[PDB]
Amino acid sequence: TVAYIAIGSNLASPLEQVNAALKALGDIPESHILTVSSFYRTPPLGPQDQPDYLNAAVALETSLAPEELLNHTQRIELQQGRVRKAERWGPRTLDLDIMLFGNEVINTERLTVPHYDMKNRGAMLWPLFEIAPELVFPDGEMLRQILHTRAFDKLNKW
Ligand SMILES: [Cl-]
What Pfam families does this protein map onto? Predict the structure, then answer.
């Protein structure tokens, strides 16, 4: 099954950690990386005197079950990133989100796929479109039509 994973890092110095995260993704059992998007830059959310986010998408071929893949992405987040000191609930320094898992729809305590908000996020959709321009969502919606209808602004490259 092809899973699509979003990577995000809002570290002041992210490119390095992102590359380490990619290595970790490629080390996941019963899996291999098919494609990695370009690295994109998105502005901080809120105060503009904070670091930009580096965003990318990864296509990962895997025979793991969806919750098994989650085990690994969670492990990698714990190993390669951390929560923020004075805000233990905000974005971690490294985010790995399972955006899509084949054509599967999943709604469990641990896992919701497709990612609940991805259709509203250029940071997810644009890198995804670079690596899977012909993608169709489980509900039948075309990635190309979402980007066109919703008239998203493109992201700058990192
Ligand atoms: Cl969907």
Answer: HPPK
